[PDB]
Amino acid sequence: DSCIQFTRHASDVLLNLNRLRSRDILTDVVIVVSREQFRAHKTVLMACSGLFYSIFTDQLKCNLSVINLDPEINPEGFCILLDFMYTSRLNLREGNIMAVMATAMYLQMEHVVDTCRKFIKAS
Amino acid sequence: DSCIQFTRHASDVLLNLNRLRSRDILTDVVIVVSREQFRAHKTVLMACSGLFYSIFTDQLKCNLSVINLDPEINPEGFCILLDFMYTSRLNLREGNIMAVMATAMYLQMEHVVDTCRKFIKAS
């Protein structure tokens, strides 16, 4: 086509979606990870995760307001990944890299799994 | 912080949100423009437009499944802007620039208004 493109548009959209999340505006699901609860937008979860994409395209699960993750999933690893989904920023540290990689493999977040594998290989 | 960043994450999120829109997955509102109807995600509309941001943060309007725009709004201008919201790509042409600018001013999409003003000034 003959379209023009606004370079910062996608980043600005994600920044505003994160502002809505921080204010709990139009969040439509709670993700339960052990004792911890995380509110989010189903569409953002689907856009970032192969697991959530599969869950919310399911004709029955698409209507659930509560999703319980596998008890092996670490709440901190999930929190770091949820923050990444809404910001593009990953808080990857020596003390959390194993929990982050395991959570990203479960959530099917291929690019996060790839950087964790590379950072582990370096050490 | 000590975060790492995935450059393409925001663009990949927006691409997936547009895939959900094209398949009518988790769309939660219909925007009526004269005879024409457009299905969308309230969160994406809010992230892109000052008008939708104001509408869906309103304690009563946040619950509406149908929003009717002012009858002066042109459906083609709205369609071009809705496509821009989900792609960062604006189909700006000599034949649509006046309708696009008027719709962007109404929707409060400041960056679109700015490029329309510049393109009109050049001609």
Partner: peptide, 4 residues
């Protein structure tokens, strides 16, 4: 704005 750019030409994509």
């Amino acid at each position: 704005w750019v030409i994509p």
